[PDB]
Every structure is written in structure tokens, then in C-alpha cells.
Write a structure and sequence with these properties.
This is part of a larger assembly, with two copies of chain A. Chain A contains six helices and 19 strands. With about 400 residues, the first copy, chain A, is an alpha/beta fold. In chain A, the strands form five sheets. A seven-stranded parallel beta sheet of chain A has the order 15-14-13-12-11-17-16. In chain A, β13, α3 and β14 form a beta-alpha-beta unit. The relative contact order of chain A is 0.10. Chains A and B meet through α5 of A and α3 of B. The structure holds sodium ion (4 copies). One sodium ion binds next to β4 of chain B. Chain B: Belongs to the glycosyl hydrolase 2 family.
Chain lengths: ~400, ~200
């Protein structure tokens, strides 16, 4: 169904069509350069101008104005319908899940005399994400991911999300010492990223690609005829969400094996947005299509040597010959019912090994739905309770909290 | 095959090995060993000595060996067992699971050591499982780890045979003696007996 919002937007004929925000820093993060690239559609005129202003609350920190026309990029010239403005910020307040400092950037399309054609805005978080010497760093410091996987689920409204439920989830997660969320397994409602920017949570943004039921799992992802469809799902997500500071990692999807399309899209992301690592678990969790070893349900000490996709113990995985990447479990500690035995073992290992930088619990909230018996009394239902067949019964309930967000 | 260089008693341990005035003496002990033994097939690894800290002389002699005999790896434990003067992480008495974070020369657990950022070398303990008396508790843990981790390629037990000496009482009856039994002082008593076999080669 139509399970997210529907709206009408009116733009002028000459309009802002895209804008990108990037932050660069010096070695000690005491100086930052805010680079904003703005793109337009419509008739170009010599009087057109673009102004980008950066605000910290009520105070304007930086500003820049320029006519359209980018730098030369190849033999034929540059983009006449683009402009890049670079704003210097001294001693910027850095964004993190601990302290989510935010600035407000306003992008103005206006004529030279001063009349405003159109304005767009976005929240700006100054932070640098990079993998150096096998460690994932945020603002120069190695992260320890206290993560959880979260589906968009409501026991009454199905997969329709609301701001109140989102805020309730974020507050509960932070109150229970979580600092990261994986959008399993699709781009979320747009307000989710804004709330994560505001409250402080690292976000893994995941493409809407999962072909788990295929035999073999990469039958489609290794087929060039499905490359366009896969590419749309990756590229449109990046184009929508690349400005959000909370998003620190891109994911190519979930449980789709490993095919050449994964490698192609990994490289596309690395080319378009070098500011964020790319991860993907399929094909054994350490393929060429991931910057992070991200296995699902690899155990702390016990090896699980399956054919062609083994789940080594996470301690052993780090030291395999020629392996240097960090390891962050994209799913672990399956919380189905009376569960989470052995969680302390994982966290002992996370604290002992530098390149074990945490993981994402599976998962946040039970996917139970509400039904009414013969007396209007509600009761929580799972797979098979709606006449659906074949079904997977109670495997939909793997959460740390009940569907009404009461804790397990 | 190990060079005859050990300066364990120095304070700090590299006081001589970091002094260029002792480089000739150290170089003689390395180079003459290599010149004598480089034809033996059984020799697969050279060692620069034992427990002498880490000084520039170690790096110089490591490179000399690498230049003259590229056919054998070079190892050295001093200075924390993972310095620039060794091709193999070769700690002494690093434990399987427990870290021992001493200042400037920590003994990480061997499993953790392999995965330290930027570390790629194999790990072979030059000494482990100290067999002093009723000992070798926990040996199975080491060998479980050795079999599970590819880059944990074993180690050298300390050590083979007790260093006890024979003395005779008032009736010509022999008895095994250790440190201090010859009037030697100061001494380190029974720490000379760390072997898997007695001095007469009967097994423990
Ligand atoms: Na860690
Ligand atoms: Na499930
Ligand atoms: Na091994
Ligand atoms: Na001894």
C-alpha cells in the first residue's frame, strides 16, 4: 500500500535541483572547510547568484556568494549550471553520538540585486569518518559500536511510522546505552535521519536489496540484467541521504550472496561519496565489496566452518593471513524470546581487541501484530495467525522490546 | 641457531646493545656464527641472541644477516618481541588468553597479538610453558590455540633438561644440587632446574 507520506511540492522554473555538503578538517580538527556544491535547473542568467550561509543557533558563522559556473574538469570545460562555495569555520563544534553538535546551512538562490528565488536548508554536523590502519575512526578516535538493528514496525499500523514512535525508540535506545542503529534492511522514513542527527546515534544506511530466497543466493546479484534495478536502489538512496551527519556507513543490502553487481555498486559509492565507508555481509562477510568485516552471528570463540562461507570466530577472523580490516558484526546476539545468553562474552572480546569495534544486536522490537478474539480483547500475533501459509511462526519476534515498546 | 649475546643483567637491558662502541663485539658473535653454520640444512632460523633489550646494533646485525643469507628468517625477542629486528613475533611466556600489559614491553595474549593494527607476521613463542618442577599446567590451552589459529605456528618449551649438578655427601652417595649448593653467593637456588627431563635424562 501507500505506507509513507504523499505530498505536493511547488518549485519555480529556475530552481535549486541538488546540493551537497562536505566537511574537511586539518590534523587536529581545529580548522574546517565546509564545501557546498549547488546545482540548478532552468534558464541560466548572468545575474543569478547562490549564497550559502552557516548558522550556529542564532549566530551566522560563515557565508559565501558566487555566480554559477564551476571549475574546469575536462577538455570540454566545466559545469555552467553548478557552483561550489567553500566556507572556513574556525574551531568547529564537532558532531558525535555523545555530543550531537549541529549547524544550520541555508542555500539561497537569488539574483544579483538581492531578490530571493528559492531557499533550501539542511542540518550540518561537522565530523570525519575514516578507516585508518584497520580501525574505524570518528573525528580521529576509534569507535566502539553499541548497535542494534531496527525494523520500521508498529503493532497497529504495520509498517507506517510516526514521529512519536521514532522518538520513543530513540530515547529508549539511548537510555539503554546504544549509540548506533542499522536500518535493516532498507532506507528509512526521512524523519528518522533528522531525529538521529538531533539526538545522536550513528546510522548505517542500507539499500533495499535482499534476495535471500534465491538459489544460489547470488543468482540475481551476479546477473548483469539485474544491475540496473540494483543500481537504482543504491544510487537513489545515496542521492537522498548523503547530507545527513548521522549516516556514517553505507550498506549495499542484506543476504544477497556476492555477485559482480555488488562490486560495481561498492565502487560507485566509493567514487561518489568517499566520506563514508561501505559495508556488505553477503558472500562470507569479507569480500571485495566491503570495507569492514561484518559477519552475522559469528561466535566469539567457536568456529563454524561452513563450505565456502565459513563463520570463523571473530577473534580468529581478525588474524587470518592478509586480513587487516576492522570487524563489526552487522547482526549478533539474536534476541528471540528468552535469549541473549553469552552477551558478556561478546563485550569482553570487544573491549579486549582493538579491531573488534562492536556490532548490531538483532534486533530492537518484536514484529508482532495485534488481533482481537471474540470479546474485542487484543492479543499479540505472529506468523501463521492470519491464515498466511507457508509461514515462519514466531521467528518474527526477535526484539529487545515488545511491540508496544515495553522492555524484555 | 642463536648468537652468543645476552646482556640480561644490564640496566636498562639495552645499555650495551644500543652503544656503537659494542657493535664490533656483537657483530663478531653474529657474523662468525653465520659463517660457521650457514651450510647446515637443519638450521632454518637465525636468532640475534637473548634478552638484550632492543638497540640499533640489533637492527644493524638483523640487516647484515638478511643481506648475507636471505634463505633463512631472522628472529629476536628483545625489546618486546615485535621490533624491527625480527621477522617473527617471538615472545617469551605470553599467555593464550590473558594480557600482561607491562610498560613499554607488554606481553599481549598471543591471540590478541596477531590482530594488532598493522601486524602481519607469524607468531612463534621462543619460550613458553616453563617446566619448573611440577609444572606444565595449561599446556593443552596453548596447543588448542596453535591448531585453531593459522598464524600461531607453535613455540619452544622452556626447557629440555634440568641444569642440576652432582655432589657427594659423607658416604660417596651422589645427590643432585642446584644454586647455592657450592657456596656460590648470591645465587638463584632451584631456578636452574626447568627441564622436561632430569639431568640424567630420565623424564618428568
Ligand atoms: Na575493540
Ligand atoms: Na526473524
Ligand atoms: Na596454527
Ligand atoms: Na632458569
Amino acid at each position: 500500500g501507500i505506507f509513507r507520506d504523499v505530498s505536493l511540492l511547488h518549485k519555480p522554473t529556475t530552481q535549486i535541483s541538488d546540493f551537497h555538503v562536505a566537511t574537511r578538517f586539518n590534523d587536529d580538527f581545529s580548522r574546517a572547510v565546509l564545501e557546498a556544491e549547488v546545482q540548478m535547473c532552468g534558464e541560466l542568467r548572468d545575474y543569478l547568484r547562490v549564497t550559502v550561509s552557516l548558522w550556529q543557533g542564532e549566530t551566522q558563522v560563515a557565508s559565501g556568494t558566487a555566480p554559477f559556473g564551476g571549475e574546469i574538469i575536462d577538455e570540454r570545460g566545466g559545469y555552467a549550471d553548478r557552483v561550489t562555495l567553500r566556507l572556513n569555520v574556525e574551531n568547529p563544534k564537532l558532531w558525535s553520538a555523545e555530543i550531537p553538535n549541529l549547524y544550520r546551512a541555508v542555500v539561497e538562490l537569488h539574483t544579483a540585486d538581492g531578490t530571493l528565488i528559492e531557499a533550501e536548508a539542511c542540518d550540518v554536523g561537522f565530523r570525519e569518518v575514516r578507516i585508518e590502519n584497520g580501525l574505524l575512526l570518528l573525528n580521529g578516535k576509534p569507535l566502539l559500536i553499541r548497535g542494534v538493528n531496527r525494523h520500521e514496525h508498529h503493532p497497529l499500523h504495520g509498517q507506517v511510522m510516526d514521529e512519536q514512535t521514532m522518538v520513543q525508540d530513540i530515547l529508549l535506545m539511548k537510555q539503554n546505552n546504544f549509540n548506533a542503529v542499522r536500518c535493516s534492511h532498507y532506507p528509512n522514513h526521512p524523519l528518522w535521519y533528522t531525529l538521529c542527527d538531533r539526538y545522536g546515534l550513528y546510522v548505517v544506511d542500507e539499500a533495499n536489496i535482499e534476495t535471500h530466497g534465491m538459489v544460489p543466493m547470488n543468482r540475481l546479484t551476479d546477473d548483469p540484467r539485474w544491475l540496473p534495478a540494483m543500481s537504482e536502489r543504491v544510487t537513489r538512496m545515496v542521492q537522498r541521504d548523503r547530507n545527513h551527519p548521522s549516516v556514517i556507513i553505507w550498506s549495499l543490502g542484506n543476504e544477497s550472496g556476492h555477485g559482480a553487481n555488488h562490486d560495481a555498486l561498492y565502487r560507485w559509492i566509493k567514487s561518489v561519496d568517499p566520506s563514508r565507508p561501505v559495508q556488505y555481509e553477503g558472500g562470507g562477510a569479507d569480500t571485495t565489496a566491503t570495507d569492514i568485516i561484518c559477519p552475522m552471528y559469528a561466535r566469539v570463540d567457536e568456529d563454524q566452518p561452513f563450505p565456502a562461507v565459513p563463520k570463523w570466530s571473530i577473534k580468529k577472523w581478525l588474524s587470518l593471513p592478509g586480513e587487516t580490516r576492522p570487524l563489526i558484526l552487522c547482526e549478533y546476539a539474536h534476541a528471540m524470546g528468552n535469549s541473549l545468553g553469552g552477551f558478556a562474552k561478546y563485550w569482553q572480546a570487544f573491549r579486549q581487541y582493538p579491531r573488534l569495534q562492536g556490532g548490531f544486536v538483532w534486533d530492537w522490537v518484536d514484529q508482532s501484530l495485534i488481533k482481537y478474539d471474540e470479546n474485542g480483547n487484543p492479543w499479540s500475533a505472529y506468523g501463521g495467525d492470519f491464515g498466511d501459509t507457508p509461514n515462519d511462526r514466531q521467528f518474527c519476534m526477535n526484539g529487545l522490546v515488545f511491540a508496544d515498546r515495553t522492555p524484555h
